Amino acid sequence: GSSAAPGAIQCMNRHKMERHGKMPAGYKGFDCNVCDQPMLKITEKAYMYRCEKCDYDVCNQCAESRKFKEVHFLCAKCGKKFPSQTKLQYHSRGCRGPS
Ligand SMILES: [Cl-]
Ligand SMILES: [Zn+2]
Ligand SMILES: [Zn+2]
Ligand SMILES: [Zn+2]
């Protein structure tokens, strides 16, 4: 249950994103889903925002400047948007329609 206001820090499917300013153990990091910058360690200079339900990870620079991916991949069965074909493919394997 989350619908961001236009221009708020949101994921591609308009949910509010959680800021992660600390690192858990076993943290593998990610490549920013918007700019592709590697984010291997969370610090005060380089931190992340995440939407858990979308598996959407963005660096603080892209999130706060409202940068968006210029290519969107959509699931035909539920309409959900993804930043890559690989993430759409992982979703699609287990999707037969809206949850
Ligand atoms: Cl839209
Ligand atoms: Zn980024
Ligand atoms: Zn989301
Ligand atoms: Zn789907």
Sign of CA dihedral 79, 84, 89, 95: negative
Which residues are close to ligand 3, an ion, with C-beta < 5 A? 11, 13, 15, 51, 54
Selection from 52, 56, 27, 60 nearest residue 41 by Cα: 27
b/e sequence 15-45, b meaning 16+ C-beta within 10 Å: bebeebeeeeeeeeebebbbeeeebeebeee
- Give the separation between CA 26 and CA 23, rounded to whole angstroms: 9
φ/ψ of 63, rounded to 5, equals -60, -50
The Cβ of residue 65 has, within 10 Å, a number of other Cβ atoms equal to 11
- Residue 31: beta bridge partners? 38
78 annotated to a ligand binding site:
yes
Name the residue with tokens 């989350």.
2
CB-side exposure of 57: number of CA atoms within 13 Å?
17
Selection from 43, 45, 46, 55 nearest residue 18 by Cα: 55
Structure tokens at 97: 């329609």
Distance 85 CA to ligand 4 centre (A): 13
State the resolution, in angstroms. Answer: 1.8
DSSP, collapsed to helix, strand or coil, labels residue 30 as strand
33 annotated to a ligand binding site:
no
Structure tokens at 83: 């930043």
Distance 72 CA to ligand 4 centre (A): 14
Ligand index nearest the alpha carbon of residue 15: 3
Q: At residue 3, what is the residue type?
A: S
All structural domains of the chain with their residue ranges: 1-99
Which experiment gave this structure?
X-ray
Q: Are 75 and 88 in contact (CB under 8 A)?
A: yes
15 annotated to a ligand binding site:
yes
75 annotated to a ligand binding site:
yes
